[PDB]
Design a protein around this ligand. Structure first.
Ligand SMILES: [Zn+2]
Lengths: 48, 195
């Protein structure tokens, strides 16, 4: 149950039941980034 | 080189003296071209420095491209790039105009492209160009860096020197030279006029 959560269960897998009351709007997060340096013009990439 | 002072900076001047040393002519890279085998496309870039425009610009320090906008590796095409030549020379006051028993004064001249191999060490020369102050004289942290950006370089001839003397011949001059020949005492007239 939701009230039976303690310090033991931290970085561990739990199974929970309940009711949903909120759902926010979808946000954008990056997965692949391409960048450039504003002074010398060096280019590289990033993967998340 | 002795009477050239800090009140003549940023003006066009004529300087007399003797060439004392010349450097090696080196290439300078302006535009570099590349190839990408994964897209079959060629890319280029431009480079510049402070000794090519008479007015001050905001620096652009671009970098040498090895990589494409996606990550493809580029081959460098040495035959398709453009290179322009460079040389530096030093000038000093002539020994027969300088004060005796006194150390001499010298000035640096920068030459590029076509004016790059016009003289040799030990020559009488006249140079015209802009007397430029460069960089920052330690105010970011002796004084300013001064040199002449050459535009004109004239060789001059003097007694007991390695530069020859030649004159331009007018057609009128040629006519007298050729007229004198027919008279059959050319040798005597030319011989008696020798000192
Ligand atoms: Zn940078």
């Amino acid at each position: 149950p939701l009230r039976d959560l303690d310090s033991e269960h931290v970085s561990k897998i739990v199974r929970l039941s309940g009711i949903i009351i909120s759902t926010s709007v979808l946000s954008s997060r990056a997965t692949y980034l391409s960048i450039m340096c504003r002074n010398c013009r060096h280019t590289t990439s990033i993967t998340i | 080189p002795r009477t050239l002072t800090a009140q003549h900076l940023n003006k066009l001047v004529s300087v007399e003296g003797i060439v004392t040393k010349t450097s090696l002519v080196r290439p300078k890279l302006i535009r570099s071209v590349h190839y990408a085998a994964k897209t079959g496309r060629f890319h280029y870039r431009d480079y510049t420095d402070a000794t090519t425009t008479l007015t001050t610009r905001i620096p652009t320090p671009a970098i040498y491209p090895t990589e494409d906008t996606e990550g493809n590796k580029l081959t460098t095409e040495y035959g398709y790039s453009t290179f322009i030549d460079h040389q530096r020379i030093t000038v000093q006051e002539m020994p027969e105009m300088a004060p005796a028993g006194q150390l001499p004064r010298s000035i640096d001249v920068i030459l590029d492209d076509d004016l790059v191999d016009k003289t040799k060490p030990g020559d009488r020369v006249n140079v015209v160009g802009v007397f430029k102050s460069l960089g920052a004289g330690g105010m970011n942290q002796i004084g300013f860096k001064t040199l002449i950006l050459g535009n004109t370089v004239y060789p001059l001839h003097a007694r007991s020197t390695g530069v020859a003397a030649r004159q331009m011949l007018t057609d009128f001059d040629i006519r007298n030279i050729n007229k004198l020949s027919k008279k059959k005492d050319i040798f005597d007239i030319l011989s008696q006029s020798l000192a």
